[PDB]
Write a protein that binds this ligand. Structure first.
Ligand SMILES: CC(=O)NCCNc1ccccc1
Length: 121
């Protein structure tokens, strides 16, 4: 139907906007601490601690599959990256501190993205 095509066009455009957001957010992790999933070969007990792991590569996979239906779904995955890190790692670690910085610097990018998504429809 024409309606389904129009809907798919909107999804494609959302994916394009979210791709830009994702690149901007990942730029705020220059150490690439959150770039890949935590390896069970390196951290064997990780899944005993964290029930819903997330990372930028996994987000990018879901993104390119047009698996984010709205910004809220995207933000919930971004939030997992930060919240998981701030649970698993203690406050005086380079990991926790990177998560704080990513949260702070990313809020700016997400504040604008929320307005843009509301604007464009
Ligand atoms: C994203 C995150 O929580 N990173 C810290 C915990 N994972 C870790 C993996 C290899 C070596 C040291 C630590």
């Amino acid at each position: 139907s024409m309606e389904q095509v129009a809907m798919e066009l909107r999804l494609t455009e959302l994916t394009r906007l979210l791709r830009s957001v994702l690149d901007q957010l990942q730029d705020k992790d220059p150490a690439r601490i959150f770039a890949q999933p935590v390896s069970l070969k390196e951290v064997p007990d990780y899944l005993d601690h964290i029930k819903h792991p997330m990372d930028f590569a996994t987000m990018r996979k879901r993104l390119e599959a047009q698996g984010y239906k709205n910004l809220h779904e995207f933000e919930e995955d971004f939030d997992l990256i930060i919240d998981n890190c701030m649970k698993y790692n203690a406050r005086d670690t380079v990991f926790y501190r990177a998560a704080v910085r990513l949260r702070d610097q990313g809020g700016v990018v997400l504040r604008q993205a929320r307005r843009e998504v509301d604007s464009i429809g």
